């Protein structure tokens, strides 16, 4: 009786991020000592789209029926543990490039694995990401954890035949999801947000171009 | 999903035949009716046909008396998106209508919406809600039932995907369609058949004339 | 609805290649009729896959007790398969599913269908299920979200088998694929458990040899 | 300018940058860039941002010989002084705080500064304070040549025309739009290694702009 | 630097060198060279020996304009100042009487000088006094550029990176490992024709080392 949940889906062509991870895999590891991953691209695209559409960043206060707009943006990434899935928080992401996002993700994942994370940074955040792609999933409905207003559900990357230029081609594709609440965000805004994340991931130069 | 009854179903409709009709007859349509040809009329007519062939979907549960009302008239509330927002203008008596009339009424209601002469009378009483979120590129998604009716058809963007025909791979322009229905009056079989029948009517518009 | 509010149901989807199942049906239909006097189908494979996955994963089989707030555990698996009758839909439950194979599942399904058709199906053969499989693919559906029948904790949504082009080994071929959906009670089952459960079901259906190999 | 060509002891280094990705990105995003940002995508934003990247990773070049005290001051800010072409002549407007700008922000600054200069509104504050120069003589069809260090700065990047030239990729021969770029540096502060690495970083940033996001 | 730029009016002439012969000889002789000399073959020794040969044939470049007397001094000995990589920074050790050794001894001299500079035991005895400096930029992948004359020499060689480039050999295009070579010379002593001939002799002696043996 609190939240009514609805979901929209879309698909992202991960054929450019794979190339980046395939060419700058040793230089990045030599200069920073971390493994390149898909998660930084999606975090940065989420930050870009949240900046473009601040209504997705806002949240309704059910106690006073007030809409609070938050200028800071934080994606609450998720890492799985044997005792249960735990959701850390990446803080102040609108001014981090791929290196900083990757390093924060690595540190938070290590802390979750060795169990030294307390509630001080587990609470808060304006966005969530539920990367269910570690365990191969085609697509699905992700739950909104409280008190957020939307969550991105990333699933596994699979090779399926897609039609580009009228010809059947095999490219690595990912199904993305966006569980929002109609009480705050309309369907058009959620569709535009997901499509903008898709655009910013499938061509990272959009971030440099501000498109 | 708690206070929605939710429980949606999805299908794929091929739009090769509909775009062929548009490419063939859009000039004549503009010359005669002074309008433009889209895929909206196909979906509205298909929904009307599907509602004719099984009216239990068109029914509404009255929780006040535990009574199901089987309304005979078909009233489809086509949603037109405007920068101010999405509204629900209602097209009356879709059973006695064709593609030209449906397009004309859709355009007229949209024009009333642009200048905001949308009276309360032409904003309710609909038996079925058709929401087009496909004007914004989206693969598929789950829409929401509009009260008091118990179903809604939401179409999405048209993309070209490879699909098998006769065992051979061929690229055709396809759509994803969705239907969220209240399980308290219509079971899964009925709603799946309803969506299949809408898809069959849109894919081959001549089944409307053949009355299948 | 009170049941809707109390249960927070979430859905996840996957796809199954129905290439091995159809081949085994093609090669093992006449022998099935000669031996068991009964025709082969699709439901037995999915029922057995769900049974094997539940045996490996007891959490999905378990249900929370609403009366006392206890996650009561069940050492026994009973799938509740929905059969179709002219007078409507009924959900008979097949009992002691761990200790039978494809042949006995077909026998039980046939007996329950012929009992429902002729209207001698009592209340003992109706309740007591632990997991449900909804075969919504008979009426040609692509995919969708099923609903859990109480007091069960999860449902597997079987859909129609469609000839669809999919790339395996870098080549595009046409294979008969089916979309599977798992609507699960999130209060008890987590995302990892649900995804792994659906993957185990899909793997067992794609290769029936996994069941006897006990992976 | 004569009192710099010998006192600064300039040496010139040259490299080729492959403008395939830049042209690809322009062809792909020009329509949307004009529709949303109300400008036109260009070559110079990429080069200015690449220079900012290289001056971030290599701060000795960003420094200047302070002849008063023989000091090498490591600035925490980068001041790119682009040569904007005007019908009257060539001027040197400056872009300030180039560490944090996207391609669109640099485009907007360059277009606004060019409109200011063409309509004769350029102020001194928009002309002084340079730290690195991106003088572009390539719209004149030049192949390659040696630029001159702009005082008080310690280096300058000279850009020239873009021509389709045969190159080797994986042992095969393919024609692609190839570009000759030059760097004229003060060898008293910058070793050969430092200047060559500077040009390699600029070339890598221009060839694959994804490096800027990837922070490699 | 300041003095070299201000006093000498150094001019630079350029050329391109095939390295396919050197690459082939390395590919076929690396294993034997390592097994016998316990050293790994390099591209540098061929260039040093070719420069020594060209200095032998043209003794004008093997000479210095004496500043005090405005005269020329002809050195019968050839010394080359090869720059050796080092994390501290590149230095300039000197090889003595380069014309008397082949590739094998130049390789061992370079290896010993690199080992000694790595441990920073580079004495000034074997550090200053050369006659012709050679600078390598191929380890940082520079395309081409003008090197600075190390004083008090009269010229310098400007070896750069080696890149596969499409070139014309007998009317058809094939990709061969090609490298730009540059010579910065004091035009006061060495004339234009002498500088071009010197660079051409270095080119000839590097393109096929059999000229060195053949004494062409």
From Swiss-Prot, chain B:
Name of the featured protein: Dihydrolipoyllysine-residue succinyltransferase component of 2-oxoglutarate dehydrogenase complex, mitochondrial
Subcellular location: Mitochondrion matrix; Nucleus
Gene name linked to the record: Dlst
Active site: 183, 187
Subunit annotation: The 2-oxoglutarate dehydrogenase complex is composed of OGDH (2-oxoglutarate dehydrogenase; E1), DLST (dihydrolipoamide succinyltransferase; E2), DLD (dihydrolipoamide dehydrogenase; E3) and the assembly factor KGD4. It contains multiple copies of the three enzymatic components (E1, E2 and E3). In the nucleus, the 2-oxoglutarate dehydrogenase complex associates with KAT2A. Interacts with ABHD11; this interaction maintains the functional lipoylation of the 2-oxoglutarate dehydrogenase complex.
Modified residues (N6-acetyllysine): 26, 31-32, 36, 66
Lineage: Eukaryota, Metazoa, Chordata, Craniata, Vertebrata
Assigned protein family: Belongs to the 2-oxoacid dehydrogenase family.
Function: Dihydrolipoamide succinyltransferase (E2) component of the 2-oxoglutarate dehydrogenase complex. The 2-oxoglutarate dehydrogenase complex catalyzes the overall conversion of 2-oxoglutarate to succinyl-CoA and CO(2). The 2-oxoglutarate dehydrogenase complex is mainly active in the mitochondrion. A fraction of the 2-oxoglutarate dehydrogenase complex also localizes in the nucleus and is required for lysine succinylation of histones: associates with KAT2A on chromatin and provides succinyl-CoA to histone succinyltransferase KAT2A.
Superkingdom of source: Eukaryota
